[PDB]
């Protein structure tokens, strides 16, 4: 869990800027490992994000190496070299439909594991999905994540914090209730972003205008060239009624079966 500052080498060039993300190298027992380091320079929030990540073990979720207490509080993670999925797709508009399906299916597998483990992510967006390879996605950014109480299937927040409203379900907005079904709503927005090659959702609209549009039963249109079955799935993720909205087990199954058909049809 606690790492030696002497064994960490930080590169001066910053990956992101929320906080700062730096590429680094950490000397392990024999080999050196490439890492991405979250720097604080708020201290209890980093420790709680570390607390969440240490409990998670899945191929589709970013692996935490440990924490470092030196100049600043640092969260050291295994490096996903290709970066955020939204920026990747913005810069690589030639990515095939079968490939986007493959990646959003990998996110659903990671979320199906988070659901089973009774953790709510609460920041599922394309900017928080990292690419290991063009064919391998991992979920990151557990800063807002919560381990659900054993007797409840939702987390209740106290007062509006720093929230990404465009990705949030109506029960999150109106009742401050976060469940794995509210993460399914964000997964629908993330899917829309993915088939829109990293375009921002609800472009040019204020959070309040997004709320009002959703309350009238309106939803973002079908992205250019997005498969119909995938757009039907987003709409099912955007079911207003929490009870009728599918869970991640159901969403993953639809993605699995559809992806196996696309792979078949290809060759
Ligand atoms: C808002 N969150 C996305 C911040 C955050 C949290 N974890 N985390 C990373 C964890 C593991 N592997 C990574 N790899 C890259 C990376 C690689 C290449 C380019 C990149 C990035 C990040 C920005 N850019 C432009 N970031 C990470 C980044």
What secondary structure, in 3-state letters, does the chain show? CECCHHHEEEEEEEEECCCEEEEEEEECCCCEEEEEEEECCCHHHHHHHHHHHHCCCCCCECCEEEEEECCCEEEEEECCCCEEHHHHHHHCCCCCHHHHHHHHHHHHHHHHHHHHCCEECCCCCHHHEEEEECCEEEECCCCCCEECCCCCCEEECCCCCCCCHHHCCHHHHHHCEEEHHHHHHHHHHHHHHHHCCCCCCCCCCCHHHHHHHHHCCCCCCCCCCCCHHHHHHHHHHCCCCCCCCCCHHHHHHHHHHHHHHHHHHHC
Q: Give the distance (Å) from ligand 1 centre to CA of residue 37.
A: 9
Q: Can you read off the two tokens belonging to residue 12?
A: 């001066």
Q: Which residues contact 27 (CB under 8 A, 6 or more apart)?
A: 7, 8
Task: Give the C-alpha distances (Å, rounded to integers) separating 71 from 41, 65, 68, 266.
Answer: 7, 18, 9, 52
Handedness of CA 71, 161, 185, 189 (dihedral sign): negative
Selection from 190, 168, 173 nearest residue 120 by Cα: 168
Strand pairing partners for 119? 147
Q: Is 110 a known ligand-binding residue?
A: no
User: Looking at beta carbons, which pairs linking 74-77 to residues 24 or more positions away fall under 8 Å?
Assistant: 74/8, 74/37, 74/38, 74/39, 74/40, 75/37, 75/38, 75/46, 75/49, 75/50, 76/3, 76/8, 76/24, 76/26, 76/35, 76/36, 76/37, 76/38, 77/35, 77/36, 77/37, 77/38, 77/53, 77/140
Which CATH number covers residue 121?
1.10.510.10
Residue 6 CA from chain centroid, whole number: 32
The number of distinct structural domains making up the chain is: 2
Query: Are 108 and 74 found together in one domain?
Result: no
Q: Can you read off the two tokens belonging to residue 209?
A: 């205008």
16 lines ligand 1 (CB under 6 A): yes
Length of the chain counted residue by residue: 267
Identify the experimental approach.
Answer: X-ray
Q: Give the distance (Å) from ligand 1 centre to CA of residue 16.
A: 7
Q: Is 104 a known ligand-binding residue?
A: no
Query: Are 112 and 204 found together in one domain?
Result: yes
Query: Are 170 and 51 found together in one domain?
Result: no
Residue nearest to atom 11 of ligand 1 (CA): 79
- What is the per-residue burial (b if ≥16 Cβ within 10 Å, else e) of 164-202? bebbbbbbbbeebbbbbbbbbbbbbbbbbbbbbbbbebb
Q: Where does a domain end: 61, 79, 97?
A: 79
Please identify, by atom number, the ligand 1 atom nearest to the C-alpha of residue 81: 17
Selection from 150, 151, 106 nearest residue 129 by Cα: 106
CA distance 142 to 157: 16
Query: Are 112 and 71 found together in one domain?
Result: no
Q: Where does a domain end: 47, 79, 111?
A: 79
Q: Give the distance (Å) from ligand 1 centre to CA of residue 15.
A: 6
Residue nearest to atom 26 of ligand 1 (CA): 83
Residue 30 CA from chain centroid, whole number: 32
Query: Are 102 and 47 found together in one domain?
Result: no
Strand pairing partners for 165? none
76 lines ligand 1 (CB under 6 A): no
Q: Where does a domain end: 19, 54, 79?
A: 79
Whether the CB-CB separation of 10 and 37 falls below 8 Å is answered with yes
Residue nearest to atom 2 of ligand 1 (CA): 128
Whether the CB-CB separation of 132 and 82 falls below 8 Å is answered with yes
Range of the domain at 105: 80-265
Q: If you search the block for the tokens 């976060």, which residue do you land on?
A: 178
Q: If you search the block for the tokens 């993953």, which residue do you land on?
A: 252
Q: Can you read off the two tokens belonging to residue 108?
A: 């659903």
Query: Are 23 and 106 found together in one domain?
Result: no
Query: Are 165 and 219 found together in one domain?
Result: yes
Query: Are 138 and 35 found together in one domain?
Result: no
Whether the CB-CB separation of 54 and 75 falls below 8 Å is answered with no
Q: If you search the block for the tokens 């792979």, which residue do you land on?
A: 263
| Ligand 1 binding pocket mutation candidate from 11, 13, 14, 16 (most atoms within 8 A of CB) | 16
Residue 158 CA from chain centroid, whole number: 23
Q: Is 239 a known ligand-binding residue?
A: no
Which CATH number covers residue 48?
3.30.200.20
Query: Are 84 and 155 found together in one domain?
Result: yes
Q: Are strands 32-39 and 154-156 parallel, antiparallel or unpaired?
A: unpaired
Query: Are 23 and 118 found together in one domain?
Result: no
Q: Give the distance (Å) from ligand 1 centre to CA of residue 122.
A: 18
Task: Give the C-alpha distances (Å, rounded to integers) separating 209 from 121, 165, 214, 216.
Answer: 25, 11, 9, 11
* φ and ψ of 202, to 5 deg: 50, 45
Query: Are 75 and 97 found together in one domain?
Result: no
CA distance 130 to 124: 12
Query: Are 73 and 86 found together in one domain?
Result: no
Please identify, by atom number, the ligand 1 atom nearest to the C-alpha of residue 79: 12
């Amino acid at each position: 869990v606690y790492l030696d500052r002497k064994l960490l080498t930080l590169e001066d060039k910053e990956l992101g800027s929320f906080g700062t993300v730096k590429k680094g190298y950490y000397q392990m027992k024999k080999v050196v490992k490439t890492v991405a380091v979250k720097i604080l320079k708020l201290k209890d929030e980093l420790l709680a994000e570390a607390n969440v990540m240490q409990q998670l073990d899945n191929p589709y979720i970013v692996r935490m190496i440990g924490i470092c207490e030196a100049e600043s509080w640092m969260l050291v993670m295994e490096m996903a070299e290709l970066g955020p999925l939204n920026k990747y797709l913005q810069q690589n508009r030639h990515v095939k439909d079968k490939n986007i399906i493959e990646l959003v299916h990998q996110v659903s597998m990671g979320m199906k594991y988070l659901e089973e483990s009774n953790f709510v992510h609460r920041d599922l967006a394309a900017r928080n999905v990292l690419l290991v390879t063009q064919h391998y996605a991992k979920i990151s950014d557990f800063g807002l994540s919560k381990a659900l109480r054993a007797d409840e299937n939702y987390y209740k927040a106290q007062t509006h914090g720093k929230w990404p409203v465009k990705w949030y379900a109506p029960e999150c907005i109106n009742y401050y209730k976060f469940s794995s079904k509210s993460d399914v709503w964000s997964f629908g927005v993330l899917m829309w972003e993915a088939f829109s090659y990293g375009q921002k959702p609800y472009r040019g609209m204020k959070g309040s205008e997004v709320t009002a549009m959703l309350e009238k039963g309106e939803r973002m249109g079908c992205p250019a060239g997005c498969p119909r079955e995938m757009y039907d799935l987003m709409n099912l993720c955007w079911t207003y009624d929490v009870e009728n909205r599918p869970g991640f087990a159901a969403v993953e199954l639809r993605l699995r079966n559809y992806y196996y058909d696309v792979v078949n049809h290809h060759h």
